[PDB]
Every structure is written in C-alpha cells, then in structure tokens.
Homo-oligomer: A and B are copies of this chain.
C-alpha cells in the first residue's frame, strides 16, 4: 500500500524527467486509498522555481477537493522534501508523509545541498507534528536508484 503509492511517485519522477517538465521528482497525494493528485516536478514546464513535485501535488489536491487543508490526506514523495516543500506540507495540514530516498541521493548527482531542518528534527524555531515515514526495503532501493539512472540517461 505504502509501496504502491511510493512506486507511483517514482514512476511520476521518471515520467517528468523524460518529458522535460522538470527534475526527477514525483509526489502523490492520497485520501483514504483514493489518489487525489499524481504529479511531478514542473519547474521547467511552468517556468516556476516553486513548482516542485510536492508543491504541484498540493496545489492540485487543494483545487480538486475545494479546501486549503489536506488533513485527511497523505503525501508520498519519491525524494525527501526540501525546506520549501516541507513548509508547504506543514501549511497544507497533510497528516502523513512517506518519502522514499534520502536527500543525499539527489545531492550525489549535483543537486542543491538543501535539506529541511524540520524534517530531520534539527531546528531551534521550526518543529514538526507531522507523521514522517522514511521508506525502507524494496521501495527505498527503487526510489534511491532514480538519481543514478537519470544521471546515466543524460551522461552523453
């Protein structure tokens, strides 16, 4: 179940990087096993540096459910959310976060050294009440191999 939606997010990351919409990142917002939004990074397509997978997914889910809170929903992120996207997940009142890969896997292929203190519990001012699960096992392995596969696809 967690595996299913995290896998869908990984596939979204691959789809988005293939169509040039943005980086290899995907997010899926679900409401009691019903998928509300299935998105990926749209930074290049939208010319929007805020259009990460999770922000895009939140925007879609909110417009679709006609409310600015997603407290009955859960978000699946193929990669550990950034400071911006974790702030967005907090503001959206999403009740649970499941992320597949560590930020270090994206930093390994050259992404910003940009990690959210509130997610890792290393803040003085910003804390978090949100349920956070780092995926393990098969889903985590699949999620982490995304960045090396993407770097290989564009090496030459």
Contacts and interface: CB of A to CB of B under 8 A. Distances in A.
Interface of A: 43-44, 46-50, 55, 58-59, 62-63, 66-69, 82-88, 90-93, 112, 114-118, 120, 122-126
Nearest to A125: B115
A155 B62 CA distance: 17
A87 B90 contact: no
A58 B50 contact: yes
A62 B47 contact: yes
Contacts of A86: 83-84, 87
19 contacts: A43-B68, A47-B66, A47-B67, A49-B62, A49-B91, A49-B92, A50-B50, A84-B84, A84-B86, A84-B87, A84-B91, A85-B87, A86-B87, A91-B112, A91-B114, A116-B125, A117-B123, A117-B124, A123-B123
